Point group: D2
Chain length 429, copies 4
């Protein structure tokens, strides 16, 4: 027989959950059984292995219940949840050389251990933290590395931000570029039209070493379900929301050194936005954003730790003008796809910065409003959105929802990932 294993090496997703990488792992586990079936159809009996850095129960986003949840879920299926030694306190999911080198080593170890017992292995690594893994496996693992195919994904150091990546990130992502060009067993999995281009043109990665791992949402997941107006108003009851004004909603991880989500840009623009109350739902409490909203005399509603139930209500409420997405250069952000789909019938429309994957998601103006990353441009964009006729708005809202169907459907795209990996397994050997 042939027994197949996906090794998912992810910096978050079981113990800790804050962003898209954790959400990718969550989407992964829900689609698992179906993918297993699909692959069985293609001759492979497939097991799932998950590797995530060991975390201190004190880390932002820790949740032991989730951990057990994921561990039990993979175990019943025949897979493992494994916590990998990084060489850190466990109190963060990122670092510099010593954190990357350790986590890569144990990541590569888990890939080879799994390959001893399997017939083939597809090792999906993500983030600069795991980027040295294909080079570590292909350089040293002999007969067992001939069983492994690498797909590396979620971020390569680029020149598309003002903040220059750390030497540690520059080095690890250059390592994986080298190995993608050097080993036919090592591919990049691009997540977006923007990174397939950028990684080809910054790192000289040939077309045959680029596999599709395109960002997507599982549209029919319950958390995206459409809501009646009674439940919408019930759900935002205790959000502290004003009774007057329309909303521009934003949410995500707090911008911190290194990644500039664009929240301050909405706050700057609310100064010249007379009917507009920004609602910024950040993951952790953000004392800094509050300091701005007061320095600008802007009456912002600042939330933290919101469930998606409340965020889904806000986006669906007829009081909500737009959801803004203002990141400096998102490689493959999925929050807009959720907005476009949760607001199928009612609520927000998307305002999307003109950088990273955002223009692709809003179809360059067709399914949403694109804006330059200046306060005046964001203020302009909101006015633009307000000036839309209800005939205009209803076909922009439809066009957005149609796109999430066509391009951003998680089961379609993870099948696109699985299918390419499996097909490539039958040509490298």
């Amino acid at each position: 027989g042939r027994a197949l294993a996906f090794v998912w090496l992810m910096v978050e997703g079981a113990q800790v959950a804050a962003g898209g990488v954790a959400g990718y792992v969550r989407n992964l586990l829900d689609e698992q059984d179906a993918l297993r079936d699909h692959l069985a159809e293609r001759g492979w009996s497939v097991e799932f292995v998950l590797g995530e850095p060991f975390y201190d129960p004190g880390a932002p986003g820790y949740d032991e219940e989730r951990w057990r949840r994921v561990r039990e879920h993979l175990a019943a299926r025949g897979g493992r949840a494994v916590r990998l030694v990084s060489d850190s306190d466990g109190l963060d999911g990122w670092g510099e050389e010593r954190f990357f080198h350790a986590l890569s080593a144990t990541g590569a170890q888990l890939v080879l251990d799994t390959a001893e017992r399997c017939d083939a292995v597809v090792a999906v690594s993500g983030t600069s933290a795991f980027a040295r893994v294909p080079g570590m496996v292909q350089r040293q693992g002999g007969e067992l590395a001939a069983k492994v195919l690498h797909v590396h994904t979620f971020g390569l150091a680029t020149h598309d931000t003002a903040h220059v990546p750390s030497p540690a990130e520059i080095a690890a992502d250059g390592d994986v570029a080298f190995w993608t060009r050097q080993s036919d067993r090592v591919s990049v999995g691009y997540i977006s039209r923007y990174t397939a281009e950028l990684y080809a043109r910054t790192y000289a990665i040939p077309a045959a070493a680029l596999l599709p791992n395109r960002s997507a949402i599982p549209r029919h997941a319950p958390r995206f379900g459409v809501l009646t107006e009674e439940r919408i108003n019930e759900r935002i009851a205790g959000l502290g929301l004003p009774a007057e004004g329309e909303f521009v909603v934003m949410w995500g991880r707090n911008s911190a050194p290194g990644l500039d989500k664009g929240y301050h840009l909405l706050l700057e623009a609310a100064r010249d936005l007379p009917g507009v109350v920004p609602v910024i739902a950040t993951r952790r409490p953000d004392p800094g954003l509050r300091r701005l909203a007061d320095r600008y005399a802007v009456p912002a509603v600042l939330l933290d730790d919101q469930p998606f139930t409340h965020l889904s209500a806000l986006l669906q409420s007829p009081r909500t003008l737009a959801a803004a997405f203002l990141g400096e250069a998102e490689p493959g952000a999925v929050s807009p796809m959720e907005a476009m789909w949760v607001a199928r019938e009612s609520g927000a429309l998307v305002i999307a910065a003109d950088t990273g994957n955002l223009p692709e998601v809003v179809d360059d103006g067709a399914a949403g409003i694109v804006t330059r990353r200046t306060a005046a441009d964001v203020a302009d964009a909101v006015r633009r959105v307000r000036k839309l006729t209800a005939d205009e708005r209803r076909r922009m809202r439809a066009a957005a929802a149609a796109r999430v169907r066509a391009r951003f459907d998680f089961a379609a795209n993870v099948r696109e990932l699985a299918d390419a990996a499996v097909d490539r397994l039958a040509e490298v050997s």
Copy 2:
């Protein structure tokens, strides 16, 4: 039920054997079943797990069939032989920062994966390449680190050699010294009288933190069995030895910048001995040793790669006056022990430099001849041995052997480690 695991982390011993670390592993496996028994009596159901850096089939000392034999030994006994990722080509078993950090991460990964399925673990770390394993486990293992006891052995960087150790070596041993002092779950396991005192005052390791892992041999193993006169000459025959002349023998690994066996000392000293032929059997052919043999034009037999069949025959021939161990800072050499035991009845007696553990092996003169590490004192020693009468020689031969029996037996010394280990498992929860 409380399942115990010994995790053995060793730089060689399955894929590759050249020195005493690999002899440790070989002795360990051959003794495993009798340790199951002792530990069974103390209520522990013990299991052996072995971790060795991944090696390229092209490396010095590789052997695919030893590796398959060790792998099966452990697997039949419910344990595991695990090849470990380092950040290397796998062609050598040592390195700089990069090799030490990857191996210590993956060794720590293997300790933690093993605590996941066992009730306690004693992790025996060996050499600077695994010196960081205690802190990697004791900083991030959380509750899994709470069921692990660390014994780090086979070297701490010292100032007893000419070669100043690598900045990587100083870091790794400096790290494990720190953790030995900081955590009641991390101990240095000393391998000799000399090492136990030296590390104690070099690193301020408190006596409670020192554990016995004293070097020793399995005296009643076949390879040390005694030989008929007839059989001795059959083996001596094919090595090309001079028809006349007394023999002084040395064997071990080729000298290299980190380790100075005294091979050069014998050749320099050789001219001052009239009718002595030096026989020097190093692991791999030594072109450099030939050159002082031609400089002093001393008559010498330079063998490479001998089986212990032929080595034993040499150490037992009446044509052999002494075996020489002239290492500069041997921490815990077992070759003298092998010599004092392979020759309880006939043949060589041992010449030991007065540095490292050798004075302890010879009982400071009472079981051998101690010499300074100069070309002159070595000859003085050869001479002294010459002038021993059968009253003094037979007496010196017995003392040495009794000494092995009482201080350097493996079964007793590995149970001292095992007993010390288990005792320390209690007293820490």
Copy 3:
């Protein structure tokens, strides 16, 4: 021709000045000409080199006009100020492996280049980030290294802190310990009794290798002048002090994961101390303390960026009951010294935590109050100050100012460093 250089490798002091290390450099420069004359009496002409990492202008404590004042000061005595490349972005004066390694390389470069132009060097190195410097000069600097004497000072990795020191800090401080025992040209510079003893016993460092660099304050500086009661009040008037209440004062750098100043302990004790007003002049503003004070409902006053003229005023007021010093493990804090000296006439008495150099500073209870590091012990400590008779208070006050004169005069103490260095330089050829 005997030209002598002191090379000062300090993590702050010229571009950036937040804490005691920067206090050191300032004291060094002011004492320079007085010191130069002392060394002129003893046969050397002296020159000062200062080596400080490169710093981005948007950084905590970055004063462009101080860098210029330091640069001109040194160059006018034929000296130099040099900024050193670390492999960092210049925003903070700290890091991990990458930071310590680059800074020590470029620091070791600055010593050797100086040793090319001078006949003798004393190279006084700063924190963990400069600890690799001795082994870097002495392993590779040949004849130039033979002209250098190293004094390493300001804190090693210890087990006196709940925060387990960073692998970078363990590895680096292990390294200089090795080199202290390896070369008579490498010495450790102790700054307190605590430091000395601790090093000797934890790091196994011989008494021959300990050189005095005991922390101290230049008590004739005008910034320690006794303030006249009209002048305290006018200075105090801006701070927002309540009209009632008696003050317990504190000031220093904001606490951070590396280092624990007890600011949150004083707020905790005030929960049991009605009428006591904590006055915590922190370096940057501390939102965390304000949230704490709000939660505990204690009437603390939280200042930031306070000048020492204003701090001196609080310390001298009759309204101020004590100054508190509550650091987890202060190696050689001069801040207690600053209090005991400024309040020689009138004002606070010192409450000192029983760890680090603090008990020695208050002479084990004969010069201030010594307390454990708990909320309740600290609240207890305040009372014992309050119940001291005005009689006993005058006795304490005079003793503390006596002790600064005897034990913590800066000028006497650097002389003691200089003489120890010159002596050691003579001794080793």
Copy 4:
């Protein structure tokens, strides 16, 4: 005023001379004054600063006198020869990560301290050991970094050779590619048409980021002269050359992992091609090459530290019918340039492999023969050289001489780079 500085960071060239890098530094300092005068005519007083690792006096290639000559040469001219801290003992001029990071850090420091006292600096970085100088200066230097143009040359890790480079090499050559794409103050100095092409299709480096540093030989140096056939056999004398009648010379270095020189194909096709008489060489005696020699049946001379005076003559005698250079992919080999120039009246005709910069040297067949790597191809090429036509090999011998004159003049090419660099110092403020 405006003083310009060329800081040359080279792994060898003054203290140690073993390879083409040392040759580049040798030719450089000879043309210093011929560039000092040129650069004045563009308005710059230029100073030359040379940086090199601290070497141990016992290292291969060490010469205390060469280092004293270079130091004084530069000092005479207002420059410096600076020895650079690396994190090794200095016995090798290479390493993995300690070495590259420390060497690049002190290199960047050297550039920056030169940038401080100059108005503009052209920092020419050497191989992977200095690849990180460009980015350590452009991230932390700040103001002084805006006065520096970085030209990194002599090798980027690529995929042409069978050899996979070290992770340390990949990381540093990844780092410099990143800064080269990112900063207009960072350029790669290309040494061949082949290297310029390769760096763009492997590192996505645009030609706009290149500057010429094209590999060249100093034609007018006395060693390159033609001389008498009397001198031919006087310089043949003192060398044990069997006189079969003719030769196919292939001098070079070891054919080992990383640097295959292709001697094997020759040996093979030759011993097979009727009546051809191969000869070879080395730089230090190659015993495995001696092995290959004893292995087949054709003459081979083990040339050991043979001066340039001897080796030129070997190529020029009418016995030599051909010289072959069959490297793996030599990025910018200068020896075929040495062959074509030396045998311009009397000597050999150059045979080149079709890999690396070699087809550029021999003008794609007009000025030499170009042959695929395989030994049946090597036979076919040496077939068209023992067969030599008057209107053919007089016309190609003169093509080869004209090629070195047109493309590979060292005086021409360092001028090209200096002008290119000064030009690009404009266009960046």
